[PDB]
Symmetry: C5
């Protein structure tokens, strides 16, 4: 796991095999991407205009098996800059600002061909904050899917509630759930898979 030249070699191999603009399909099956959200913070919450500002830890994984190697005497994982990798084109449907990445833009590649990209993000969303002061709290739903690939090319999926959530927040997390969802729009005949993350939270009392 710890020879610089072995790492430089693995990296070199990934840079040949990997085509960054082409989706990594195997055997006529959609690429199976698994998304999961962990919340880190809730910073602002406007009940008049229906917006929140959050920081979340976005764990995405997929399998590009052509990147795989034998690791019996070499390292099992390495870090690659994401400009050298195809990453999925996920978008959050009810975002109202550009996503702001707060972490170095690197992925792990695992010798079985698995790719993990888990950046931490700040973003404002437009959502229902009705009930944020009550005891049963508000429920804001976030929708996240593949922007330009339909369900026959990219298949999204959902992989404790407050394990990484700051203790210095004004808000508290009651429950967080994730549901897979295939949806068609009147524009395009094809479906787009998304994950709907439903966060249930309230102000602290």
């Amino acid at each position: 796991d710890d020879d610089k030249l072995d790492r430089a070699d693995i990296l070199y191999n990934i840079r040949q095999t990997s085509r960054p603009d082409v989706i990594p399909t195997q055997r006529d099956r959609p690429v199976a991407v698994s998304v999961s959200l962990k919340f880190i913070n809730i910073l602002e919450v406007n009940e008049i205009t229906n917006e929140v500002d959050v920081v979340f830890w976005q764990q995405t994984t997929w399998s590009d098996r052509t990147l795989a190697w034998n690791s019996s005497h070499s390292p099992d994982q390495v870090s690659v800059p994401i400009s050298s990798l195809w990453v999925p084109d996920l978008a959050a449907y009810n975002a109202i600002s550009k996503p702001e990445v707060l972490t170095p833009q690197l992925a792990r590649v695992v010798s079985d061909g698995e790719v993990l990209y888990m950046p931490s993000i700040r973003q404002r969303f437009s959502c229902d904050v009705s009930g944020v002061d009550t005891e049963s709290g508000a429920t804001c739903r976030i929708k996240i899917g593949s922007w330009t690939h339909h369900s026959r090319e990219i298949s999204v999926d959902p992989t404790d509630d407050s394990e990484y959530f700051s203790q210095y927040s004004r808000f508290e997390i009651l429950d967080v759930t994730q549901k897979k969802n295939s949806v068609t729009y009147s524009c395009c005949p094809e479906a787009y898979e998304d994950v709907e993350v439903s966060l249930n939270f309230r102000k602290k009392g």
Copy 2:
């Protein structure tokens, strides 16, 4: 369609597109202007200021055109592919009454279809100066957005327009009507005519 996931067939189409594609040159065919279809679909309203007459909107910008030099036989290969928009010509659209840089909320990819059609449909948050009077009244306020090609006159580029289903439930405002008109203006600066789509939007507060 059944052959939509050959990673190799896909890579080959991307390669092909990158060779034929001339990103800086308008893809005219047969001495006709490029016809570009332009439409908005509103997603949200974020800020309304009745004093200064401004509005923040997130709208979904539907833009399509064709370049038959990119076409291919898709009988046994993928029907569409995604392409980074730096590899294709894109039209230089501009909103005349906009007062801030447009902010693109989605990945900057276009779809290319086997028949030579190109679809670029970004989601955009932008700020416009427009008439926002009547917004607390039953008829509502009517605000227009004028979107035309900036450098190419009508002789080279024409823009044509092709209810808020994708409009947020949680917005403070409600849409009443959305119409789309085609204008063709000659400015006192240049002897030629620039075309544009006008998008009139009637909207009002809820309660």
Copy 3:
């Protein structure tokens, strides 16, 4: 001629010739004479004003033109003009002496190059300036100046020649703006500073405006 404007292959060749000849970092001087650059502002919107700090926020259309005849070609059977990315062309290095923010370009960064070596670049720009705003409430309006000059090139290399004057200054201006424009004028100035024995040419633009209603 206008009849051949669209032939895709012809346009590409013109774009190719332009890149082979254009030197983006060199002033296109002709015959021991300075490069003449025509400058015209047209105001679009006056976004905000602060009478206490003396700042304004404007959107203007900045029309700029100049000649490089080494770019010319025979338009007898060819497109008369084409659009070019400005990264492929020399562009004048104009600065706003009293800008207090970076310029934000609103529009696509493309120039039109015409078949006789004329280049037009007219972006739309939002910028914040520092100027005299007192009077803005009265009926005679306020009067705010903006100096714009060549930063690193002096008069014998670049001369900004005033493109004035209107009609017409209230034409591209938002009618839905809190403010209205009385008059606009332009002046060519030529200043020699402490540092350099060389003189820099600038264009002073005066905008007279008041709050409506």
Copy 4:
């Protein structure tokens, strides 16, 4: 040696040699031992404080050093150190876990390379953090806790090792009572392996 240092050609050759031996995307691990990165925060200012929202704005000088023997050269008759743009060098991927903004880098982005293989990267950063701010308008003051860790590399590849009004501003509204720096290894339920990090405790109060 100190005499050499000013030879424009000698430096050019050193800088050439570094760009060739340096691979920016590979951790400079030697001997099967995890790269040791020494980190150190010196505070410079405390600017925006919100007691209601638990946010703070700080300008701090981050001091980072590590060792890469492959970059080393015989400096008997050449310069002992040179400046290098960090685009030419591997730099560790550090990240503040409680930062709620993107770091704003206030200084030129150069590192120093010493001829014995030490690399020194010491940028001045402004950044907003989410932390315990209550107690700030009182004498024992507040106690914030920034944590700085290796994002994608775990303990077997990168290991952080720790190491104060000297560089702090006397024109700050705030003043500093104590600063401590502990090493911390923690395992998150996602990945089997542990990540090293440095909890920097800052103790400070408003004036008067």
Copy 5:
């Protein structure tokens, strides 16, 4: 003879072939003498509570690299060059509390005798003593500018005729005095000295 376009492009080519942008241009084993002056253009704001100050200043940097020099007998005396092609000094304000914002194009003059001039106009926020701004004596704010990564054996900053000369007449504030001075500090992390120039600005509000 300053305008022959071919002579310019040739000079610009010679400059790119011999110039190494990442290497300090030292000569005869002496440090590089970088000369620095600040002329103030404006003051945007002042916060008495927090000791912040927003200022627009014209930074005047000049230094020599005799390896760029050419014979200007029948070619131009000077030319403009993108700073990406040249080595440029890594200056920094110790008491800056914001990213510097360059308001001007990033071009340097090169003079044929080997001299380089980089003179950008900059907008930056500083933290400094601001008390006394309303009083007739005025407040005194100190900016400390120095070389960040290069110590004194490598780069030395030397300050080089009245202010209120490029200073905006429309400012709330007026400048009472400006003095430049040179210090040389060693910090407890590293045994080599770093030179800086402290610009002292004495100013007050107007009546």
